[PDB]
Design a binder for this molecule. Structure first.
Ligand SMILES: COc1cc2c(cc1OC)-c1c/c(=N\c3c(C)cc(C)cc3C)n(C)c(=O)n1CC2
Ligand SMILES: COc1cc2c(cc1OC)-c1c/c(=N\c3c(C)cc(C)cc3C)n(C)c(=O)n1CC2
Ligand SMILES: [Mg+2]
Ligand SMILES: [Mg+2]
Ligand SMILES: [Mn+2]
Ligand SMILES: [Mn+2]
Lengths: 369, 363
């Protein structure tokens, strides 16, 4: 019955691609081909590297075998669908790691902090640059990373609105409230608890484990796009009406973690053209599969989900303008965006990609009109 | 095989008690004895009478057989535990009906239904059923019937502390209330013999389901203070309660199902004390199980060390009292003009509070 991590445990010939993890535009699809399509190891392998990179194994006496057992079971439970698969989960984990360990221009380190981890890739001795992992305790950072790995577990390639409209068993079970996000969290925790071979958290005390579980759940549930505007408003409030992010306040740290996983979840439009376009193919393929089923069931086809009338450019442009753009703006306004001091001015790779990708789609719109 | 209602759908031997439904201190335990303790028909029989009394069957072309099928299946699924049983569910349904149908002094009256027990000659009175559309009222009543379905006689905190499958399933968030709503809707949808809502259109049905869920989830005591604050907010704000606003009517409905859920301390001594025995018995059963494990026994749950009077007094002072005060302040409490108002409900709550204080002093 229990799914255990294959004898090799850590694969050895992937070192060249794995060295590139500390870039924003990590070539994740090249990693897929390297490892093997539907080999089912990308997540556990990347998880190992990133946890190793942060010294999380040592920080929480995590047994590597149980870690790799759980993460393999987890990744096996991601379905082979175009977008919400184990490759997306790996991508999201890489993004929250990048966002939390890379230099942020003019970020202050929290007074009185000794407990925290730092990436081996964070070798700078600058006072002009900080990173989130210096302001967020290791337990909370680990919670965020595990959440990213878990966050879309057993996704069926349909939206919540679809599950609700068709009274799917999941929607009835969760009373039409964050159906998939509740499922991802609940199923992934159930998986964890089902076997002692999965108990990589054996050395947290009872209090720590309970707090960890709470944080993981809050992070996963924050991925419901239905609550996107509420989260952005609430964060904007703390930066505009309030004294800003109190890194000493547990609730402010939670809210940064949630904004962080949200940005990571929908990072595609903020990547280089190549990655962005590959992820686009994935998501629109899931949408059309839903459109097919909606039609066959006599329900009206949802916007942007008709293969016959795609409106691809409109989907992309509006998604960037209404969702991703405001989220990046909000996150930048708090000063959490990785970036570089120019020669003061800040150069920000993430918002620059988002601008270029937005331009690109606005051009297709004119040409098609 | 589905659970269907007993062939003679309406019982005929309960007429002396069922006419007394339009009193606050409905003798519900006498009805239990009339029907038979574990006969399992109390909820469906009361539901029939109240829906009949409101003309809801006619208002929504509800087929009575499917209605009675569902409500019997529902009541069968309430467990035989001391408090969170089908008798509590019936009690809660009776309370929301009473609160929404009975005369409220100086309430402005505004499709809608009215109780047969309500005369329209007295202008100095209104009732909530005149300000809340029939669909929303029906949602509230069905919610009350469903609201504690398949209760295991343990608190959410217990289920969370012991990583019960339900707590893992609902991520520690309103575990029981999510379960009650989800299990009761699953039951409804499982059989066409249960589809008493067949004649709502798609829009109405969706809105109905949303309202029912919101009412059930509002019974989580963890959210008690938020609801009371929010309601006090709308009352003490400008324009007060806007009966034309849907979100203002939802909060009224939620405050109504909340008051009904914990109505016991606002009943006559006799009823109050019977319900007390029930709840403390569930608490001690949980206390037992907590000690069977290595968990510390929760406050007021040790039978070998009871703080009954403290439990009662603090529950009234911290929970019930503020809720009644809030609800009275909005002017929604049933009562009689005697420029003075006599209010049976707040009167009972005061007396029961006094009673427990006295008991605390004697020690
Ligand atoms: C990374 O690329 C993308 C990733 C996603 C989505 C779109 C992407 O690009 C367009 C996406 C969109 C979505 N609904 C929306 C749709 C349809 C269009 C728009 C304009 C806005 C929303 C919220 N809904 C409900 C949804 O589940 N998703 C999945 C995540
Ligand atoms: C109407 O009678 C009663 C009905 C209930 C409860 C108490 C009653 O009166 C004692 C009750 C109380 C409870 N917790 C509390 C306890 C224990 C004590 C106090 C002071 C306050 C709360 C919120 N919790 C967690 C709980 O589940 N319940 C069940 C509903
Ligand atoms: Mg998701
Ligand atoms: Mg309850
Ligand atoms: Mn995702
Ligand atoms: Mn109840």
């Amino acid at each position: 019955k229990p799914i255990l991590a294959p004898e090799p445990l850590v694969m050895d010939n992937l070192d060249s691609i794995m060295e590139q993890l500390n870039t924003w535009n990590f070539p994740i699809f090249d990693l897929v081909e390297n490892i093997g399509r539907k080999c089912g190891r990308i997540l556990s392998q990347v998880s190992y590297r990133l946890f190793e990179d942060m010294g999380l194994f040592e920080a929480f006496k995590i047994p590597i075998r149980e870690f790799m057992n759980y993460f393999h079971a987890l990744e096996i439970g991601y379905r082979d669908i175009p977008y919400h698969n184990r490759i997306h989960a790996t991508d999201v984990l890489h993004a929250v790691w990048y966002l939390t360990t890379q230099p942020i221009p003019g970020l202050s380190t929290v007074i009185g902090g000794s407990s925290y981890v730092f990436s081996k890739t964070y070798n700078v001795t600058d006072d002009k640059y900080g990173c989130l992992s210096g302001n967020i305790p290791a337990l909370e950072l680990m919670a965020l990373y595990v959440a990213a790995a878990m966050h879309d577990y057993d996704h069926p390639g349909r939206t919540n609105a679809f599950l609700v409209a068709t009274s799917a068993p999941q929607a009835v079970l969760y009373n039409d409230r964050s159906v998939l996000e509740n499922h991802h969290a609940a199923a992934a925790w159930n998986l964890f608890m089902s076997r002692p071979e999965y108990n990589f958290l054996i050395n947290l005390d009872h209090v720590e484990f309970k707090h960890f579980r709470f944080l993981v759940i809050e992070a996963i549930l924050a991925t419901d796009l239905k609550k996107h505007f509420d989260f952005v408003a609430k964060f904007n409030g703390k930066v505009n009406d309030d004294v800003g992010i109190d890194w000493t306040n547990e609730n402010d740290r939670l809210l940064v973690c949630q904004m962080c996983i949200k940005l990571a979840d929908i990072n595609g439009p903020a990547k280089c053209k190549e990655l962005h376009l590959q992820w686009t193919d994935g998501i629109v393929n899931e949408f059309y599969e839903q459109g097919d089923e909606e039609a066959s069931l006599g329900l009206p086809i949802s916007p942007f989900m008709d293969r016959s009338a795609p409106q691809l450019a409109n989907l992309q442009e509006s998604f960037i303008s209404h969702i991703v753009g405001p989220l990046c703006n909000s996150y930048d306004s708090a000063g959490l965006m990785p970036g570089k001091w120019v020669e003061r001015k800040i150069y920000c790779q993430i918002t620059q990609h988002l601008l270029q990708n937005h331009k690109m789609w606005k051009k297709v719109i004119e040409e098609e009109q």
